[PDB]
Amino acid sequence: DDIEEVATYINGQTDMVKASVNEKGQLQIFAGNNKVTGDVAFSGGLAGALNMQAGTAETVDTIDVTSVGGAQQSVAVIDSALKYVDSHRAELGAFQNRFNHAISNLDN
Amino acid sequence: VAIQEEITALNDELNRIAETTSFGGNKLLNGTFSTKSFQIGADNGEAVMLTLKD
Numbered sequence: 001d002d003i004e005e006v007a008t009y010i011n012g013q014t015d016m017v018k019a020s021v022n023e024k025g026q027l028q029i030f031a032g033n034n035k036v037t038g039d040v041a042f043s044g045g046l047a048g049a050l051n052m053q054a055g056t057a058e059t060v061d062t063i064d065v066t067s068v069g070g071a072q073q074s075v076a077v078i079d080s081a082l083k084y085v086d087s088h089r090a091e092l093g094a095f096q097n098r099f100n101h102a103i104s105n106l107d108n
Numbered sequence: 109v110a111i112q113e114e115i116t117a118l119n120d121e122l123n124r125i126a127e128t129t130s131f132g133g134n135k136l137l138n139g140t141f142s143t144k145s146f147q148i149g150a151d152n153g154e155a156v157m158l159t160l161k162d
Contacts, residue, residue, distance in 0.1 A: 004145050007153035019153040021145060030152075068145065068155075075152040 003027060006046070018076040022069025026050075030058070030073055032080025034087070126162070136160050 010019035020028035063074035139162030145155035
């Protein structure tokens with residue numbers, strides 16, 4: 001498998017981490033805070049060859065697409081963001097519905 | 109000599125073709141293109157690499 005095929009394989013086998021490949025050819029694993037709560041311990045023969053580095057923080061406010069690597073990582077960040085956004089909406093949705101039922105009972 | 113002169117001209121033609129071809133601004137055959145990946149999916153890490161040689 002070439003580096004790009006490796007990235008797709010990872011993205012396919014797991015949804016916990018989202019891989020990517022930058023311009024040079026380095027692999028970019030992104031783990032959204034809403035899914036992982038800590039640094040990932042990359043291990044195994046592949047890891048040894050790739051030599052994965054530390055995990056800088058990347059919030060939407062920090063998405064630079066001027067480079068392909070940055071664009072690929074940015075897609076992942078945006079996805080993690082959309083999940084956070086939606087989840088909150090869902091929570092608020094229940095609040096509305098719950099308050100709706102409450103109003104009905106209070107009226108009764 | 110005559111033939112060589114003609115070959116020399118054609119020779120230059122091949123060189124320019126290689127150094128002049130340019131999709132928009134990006135050059136293609138000069139050798140600088142190397143390899144770029146083309147994201148062809150709706151999720152990251154789906155890109156497929158494409159390589160253009162000198």
